[PDB]
Structure 1
Amino acid sequence: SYDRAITVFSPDGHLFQVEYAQEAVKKGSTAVGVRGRDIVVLGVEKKSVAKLQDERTVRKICALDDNVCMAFAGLTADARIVINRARVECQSHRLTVEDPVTVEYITRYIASLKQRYTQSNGRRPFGISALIVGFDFDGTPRLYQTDPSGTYHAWKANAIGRGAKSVREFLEKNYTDEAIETDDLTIKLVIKALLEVVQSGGKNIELAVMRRDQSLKILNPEEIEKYVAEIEKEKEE
């Protein structure tokens, strides 16, 4: 079996394979999360359109368990491996603790998987970041982010993928008690955040929500463009 050291230090303390994995994330489709008051929302860009594509087969938002889902940006094949490992683990946890995973537990698990692939022979790092959302047993809503290095943090709102810098800038200005007072405004805050960067807006922003105890709901293109008009005609005033 192949034992080559793949991720190694360079002069000045860099881990080039990890940095390059981060470059792969930056060329992925934009993905955004906001933590509401009693809802959490994920939206993600595009990716290409293409009328001949079966939409269902290429979603970038994924259930891990009933109370936890995730979006990713970066190498879609890499993600699929991370997603399935996390799904297996949610069932191991439920087996041996008889509670659903906390969002932090599975986040911590994904992150340390990622970290392991930056420090094990024969492997390159995973080329993805993830936004992980759900609710804890006590109803507290959660939004976590992981990156190829295996670092993770909780966020009020965040973006990853191409144009994350400007989308994060927008969220810093627009994330207030007022923008998340209700469910519709939380959802719209995500759509505004994307609509900034999303090329032929929009059209192609896949979106999903999660409510306390309520499990994952994805919005259809009819239900999305309702919110698009309901924000577009508001920005004329």
Structure 2
Amino acid sequence: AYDRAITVFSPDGRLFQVEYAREAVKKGSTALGMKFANGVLLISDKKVRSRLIEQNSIEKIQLIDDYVAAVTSGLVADARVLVDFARISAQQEKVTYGSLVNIENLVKRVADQMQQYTQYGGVRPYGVSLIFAGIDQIGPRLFDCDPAGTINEYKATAIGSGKDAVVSFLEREYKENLPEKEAVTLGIKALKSSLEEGEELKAPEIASITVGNKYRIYDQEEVKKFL
């Protein structure tokens, strides 16, 4: 009766459409990130199938600008378009003010975009969740966002399939000011446990940035070193 149309509050105060959307994201790949020493890092599980896929081309961690990256989970198409929006939106703040001072703001704009489809009648919501990570005027910052447009800042978090799992590991073994090398480790370990019901961690995709400079994408061998 109440779960066929997205418009519309249910008798219990819920937007079923936005819920159904959330479902789509759970079925998405698993990724996480966390603040560490003097930067923040992002790590996504790059689960590959055929030998025929062009490897790296399936980049899950995408750059918004040299100092801010984001990783997404959910309907791939929706994620892409929502990424590009943030990209140009980023550029916009740069060209008017001369500098993207607060990253929090960047996420808020993209969040509001998503929030709009939450109420404007004829249009399906964005079936995706993502997290933005980078260092701004305030310092290293970590945010996540869901199809509802809800946004929160973390010390560490995850998203996608094995969220509940990996998140609990961190919830437990997360170490405040863990230096990069150890942080990436704790992370990869956390990512493992979670999705690793299927043993093989495969080839994770990892990148990081530290206050004072631009983002660094880990090379095949470097990541394989922690793997």
8 Å contact from structure 2 (residues 43, 204) kept in 1: yes
In 1, distance between residues paired with 2:119 and 2:212?
38
Q: Which amino acid aligns with 1:124?
A: R
8 Å contact from structure 2 (residues 203, 224) kept in 1: no
Identity of aligned residues (%): 41
2:8 match: 8
2:108 match: 108
In 2, distance between residues paired with 1:63 and 1:87?
8
1:36 counterpart = 2:36? yes
1:183 counterpart = 2:184? no
SS in 1 for 2:90: helix
Q: Which amino acid aligns with 1:217?
A: R
In 1, distance between residues paired with 2:75 and 2:224?
28
8 Å contact from structure 2 (residues 43, 206) kept in 1: yes
1:215 match: 214
Q: Which amino acid aligns with 2:140?
A: P
- C-alpha distance 23-8 of structure 1, shift in aligned 2 (>3 A): same
Moved more, 217-226 or 75-84: 217-226
In 2, distance between residues paired with 1:218 and 1:225?
13
Structure 1 residue 56, shift from structure 2 partner: 2.7
2:164 match: 165
8 Å contact from structure 2 (residues 141, 153) kept in 1: yes
In 1, distance between residues paired with 2:222 and 2:123?
42
Structure 1 residue 96, shift from structure 2 partner: 1.1
In 2, distance between residues paired with 1:114 and 1:194?
28
Structure 1 residue 159, shift from structure 2 partner: 0.8
8 Å contact from structure 2 (residues 33, 41) kept in 1: yes
Moved more, 210-219 or 185-194: 210-219
Structure 1 residue 53, shift from structure 2 partner: 0.7
Runs ≥4 residues deviating over 6 A: none
Moved more, 45-54 or 188-197: 45-54
Gaps of 5+ in 1: 229-237
Moved more, 197-206 or 24-33: 197-206
In 2, distance between residues paired with 1:189 and 1:49?
26
2:23 match: 23
1:89 match: 89
8 Å contact from structure 2 (residues 46, 60) kept in 1: no
In 2, distance between residues paired with 1:7 and 1:64?
32
Q: How high is the TM-score relative to the length of structure 2? A: 0.92
Q: Which amino acid aligns with 2:192?
A: L
Q: Which amino acid aligns with 1:183?
A: E
Corresponding residue pairs, total: 221
SS in 2 for 1:215: coil
Moved more, 99-108 or 123-132: 99-108
8 Å contact from structure 2 (residues 47, 202) kept in 1: no
Q: How high is the TM-score relative to the length of structure 1? A: 0.88
SS in 2 for 1:113: helix
8 Å contact from structure 1 (residues 102, 135) kept in 2: no
Structure 1 residue 163, shift from structure 2 partner: 1.4
